């Protein structure tokens, strides 16, 4: 197994993947890693057995169908994935925790959002549909472009952003345009 976290990148107290290479710490890996479970895989190999169980599930789909599914077992595992995913990239600390609003000519967002409180609406299975999710987290970028304004700063939203929804249509197998 990786000798550091495959989410964070630094050593410590990991857990390690019994069907892949990969290792996590306790709450970088989403779920948090679970208590026993003896072999234990990893989000990475549970997502690829859902792929090689029905390898039809790769062909291309409209993001307005992907949006309405019901969080049922297999699309709660994939929108915690794409958490997973946007946490892995090391500029997503901007935008982990609550944020505070406080900047001369800008008025902070109605709706704040984070991304650990995504990971706990998930957690508590507050979202019923994808779509709950997948606004919450382009909720995230909107509110740092809208409050950055002019502040080259924005730029952070538009990279985590851009990071989230080519792994949104990677992880859903959103149809491929031009
Ligand atoms: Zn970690
Ligand atoms: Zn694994
Ligand atoms: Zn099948």
């Given at each position: 197994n990786s000798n550091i976290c495959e989410v964070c990148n630094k050593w410590g107290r990991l857990?390690?993947?019994?069907?892949?290479?990969?290792?996590?710490?306790?709450?970088?890996?989403?779920?948090?890693?679970?208590?026993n479970k003896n072999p234990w895989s990893?989000?990475?190999?549970?997502?690829?057995?859902?792929?090689?169980?029905?390898?039809?599930?790769?062909?291309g789909?409209?993001?307005?169908?992907?949006?309405?599914?019901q969080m049922l077992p297999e699309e709660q595992l994939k929108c915690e994935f794409l958490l997973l995913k946007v946490y892995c990239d090391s500029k997503s600390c901007?935008?982990?925790?609550?944020?505070?609003?406080?900047?001369?000519?800008?008025?902070?967002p109605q709706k704040p959002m984070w991304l650990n409180k995504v990971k706990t609406?998930?957690?508590?299975?507050?979202?019923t549909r994808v779509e709950g999710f997948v606004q919450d987290m382009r909720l995230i970028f909107?509110?740092?472009?809208?409050?950055?304004?002019?502040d080259k700063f924005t730029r952070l939203g538009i990279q985590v952003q851009d990071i989230?929804?080519?792994?949104?249509?990677?992880?859903?197998?959103?149809?491929?345009?031009?």
């Open positions: 857990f390690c993947c019994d069907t892949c290479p990969r290792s996590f710490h306790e709450h970088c890996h989403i779920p948090s890693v679970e208590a990893c989000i990475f190999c549970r997502i690829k057995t859902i792929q090689e169980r029905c390898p039809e599930s790769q062909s789909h409209q993001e307005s169908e992907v949006l309405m599914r901007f935008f982990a925790s609550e944020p505070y609003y406080n900047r001369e000519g800008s008025q902070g609406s998930l957690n508590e299975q507050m979202y909107h509110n740092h472009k809208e409050f950055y304004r002019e989230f929804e080519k792994n949104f249509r990677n992880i859903f197998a959103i149809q491929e345009t031009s």
